Each structure stands twice: as structure tokens, then as C-alpha cells.
Amino acid sequence: ACREWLGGCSKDADCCAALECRKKWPYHCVWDWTV
């Protein structure tokens, strides 16, 4: 499985989908398409 929203950043390639690797604390997948 991949890390969903608020899931720990493993990669910045969405990590799951439509997300990004947070570049600021806390470092977990946040929705990119929501900005």
C-alpha cells in the first residue's frame, strides 16, 4: 500500500495519487490538486 493523505512522505511522486511530499513540517502526503 502507499501512504494516503497525512501519511508519512516516502516519495514526492504523489506517494499515492494527487498528493505531494510536504516540504514543511509535518512531512506527510498533502493534496496537491487542492493546493
UniProtKB/Swiss-Prot annotation:
It is found in: Secreted. Expressed by the venom gland. This is Mu-theraphotoxin-Cg1a. The presence of a 'disulfide through disulfide knot' structurally defines this protein as a knottin. Coiled coil: none annotated. Disulfide bonds join C2-C16, C9-C21, C15-C29. Negative results: does not inhibit TTX-resistant sodium currents on rat dorsal root ganglion (DRG) neurons. Has no activity on voltage-gated potassium channel Kv2.1/KCNB1 expressed in frog oocytes. Does not show activity towards Nav1.1/SCN1A, Nav1.2/SCN2A, Nav1.4/SCN4A, Nav1.5/SCN5A, Nav1.6/SCN8A, Nav1.8/SCN10A sodium channel. Belongs to the neurotoxin 10 (Hwtx-1) family. 39 (Jztx-34) subfamily. Potent and selective inhibitor of hNav1.7/SCN9A (IC(50)=610 nM). Also shows a weak activity towards Nav1.3/SCN3A (IC(50)=7950 nM). In addition, inhibits voltage-gated potassium channels (Kv) in rat DRG neurons. It does not alter the voltage dependence of activation, but it causes a small hyperpolarizing shift in the steady-state inactivations of Nav1.7/SNC9A.
